[PDB]
């Protein structure tokens, strides 16, 4: 023909994009080697969780005035409880191969993040900022910081721990935030000031899991990756950095990122920036949103669950259930379980004890 | 490497025991010819 | 066949080779071990790290 | 005195049959707890057929 | 051997899950259906066109 590769100059090779737009393009079917890339954000839900309400949206991305009560117990206001943010991104379905008992799942390999609005913090001129000294300027936003985000294919698992169990958090009302005694069903004990394996709960909703109560449970967050930071001081300065060159890899030691179960990408984040020192002396926290640039790809996996046994569970007559005696858990009425496979040379002791300290 | 069959006595072949414990044990993956 | 390792037995008898500690509970009703995983061999990648049985 | 012994092993809940010595008896009603009687299964007062099969 | 083939379960499942359709009765005692014919292959022309098989 007329390519003329020798005469035609050399131009580097880069991956081409098939489409660019909003979520609507996510419904485009692709090949196996395709790589999508999602850019999204998450506004901070920090007690005043919506600008739409007309009465008091003047404090969006803020909290009401924090101050110690002065008499036991503490009855904190919902708008003084910063909570984690969260969102789910529904991803399209993929191919499957029943004969080979394999299928495709979305894998998150790398994430690029950044805190939006950092520059907005140099506003020392707010009509109610407490002056640092007479005839001077206000006290810049500073103090406590709590930075955290998480990327995973299932909701982030959480662990509960508080600074005082005497604290009477707002009730379990639907609009109210989730607290320790919400999931337990009983007034929380002083055990909860330390770690309590019973105080666990997945991060279901938004703006309902307060920060000062919940922390990421490291034991079961295994199909997700989270990062965190903190600084605690009265007027401690706030140091933040940002760029678009920093990319974070999510792969594990085996070489896989979080797998999106239910074709859903789960993102969680929370960034407390600092206080706002009012002229009246009162104080209130503030937060900023985050940018998320997740790089997704397609991976083949083996279906670990037998289909027929799994679907039969939905039928009543095939999966019967009863309210029997406790045979599983803390009150299990089982004394021993033995598994036999293959044959070996006869051992002497039939009641083999494996632990050394026991006998 | 193998031990001398004449120098070493033989024993019976009892079914091999993989594990003994509470309820948390049933999660163990076993072969197609296992017994519980 | 002798089921118990000879050396590990006598190791129990000595306080030096079997040191003990009166620490927080890691067995019994109030144990403080949240999960234990045991890996051996290799298989094809499963589609769920939170395997249920 | 009186003895009654039974055990059942199966992959399904045991299937039962109702038979009472006297249908005149009024067993306690099922109120989110309490025994379940033929009255509870049928929704009617026990008929003298129930003394038979 | 799976007694119930999966395909039949699939349709039998989503149909109940899918939103029901309360149309005019087309099955049962008051079905609004009059004739239902079924053909297969070709035969020599029979005499009676009102034949019933
Ligand atoms: Ca774990």
Residue numbers in the entry:
A (entry chain A): 18 to 376
B (entry chain B): 18 to 53
C (entry chain C), E (entry chain B): 319 to 371
D (entry chain B): 160 to 212
Give the original sentences from the paper that presented this experimental model.
MCPyV cell entry is unique among members of the polyomavirus family as it requires the engagement of two types of glycans, sialylated oligosaccharides and sulfated glycosaminoglycans (GAGs). On the virus side, PyV-receptor interactions are mediated entirely by the major capsid protein VP1, which forms the capsid outer layer. VP1 assembles into 72 pentameric capsomers, giving rise to small capsids of 45 to 50 nm in diameter.
Using the fVLP preparation, we solved crystallographic and cryo-EM structures of the outer (VP1-only) MCPyV capsid. The structures have 3.5-Å and 3.4-Å resolutions, with no significant differences between them. The crystallographic electron density shows unambiguously that only Cys25 is involved in the ringlike intracapsomer disulfide bridges, tethering each VP1 N terminus covalently to its clockwise (cw) neighbor’s CD-loop (residues 108 to 118) via Cys117, the mPyV Cys115 homolog. Additionally, the MCPyV crystal structure revealed unique intercapsomer disulfide bridges, rendered possible by the presence of two additional cysteines (Cys18 and Cys24). The trinity knot is located at the interface between two local pentamers and one strict pentamer tethering each of the α-, α′-, and γ-chains to the respective other two. For our MCPyV capsids, we provided 1 mM calcium chloride in all buffers.
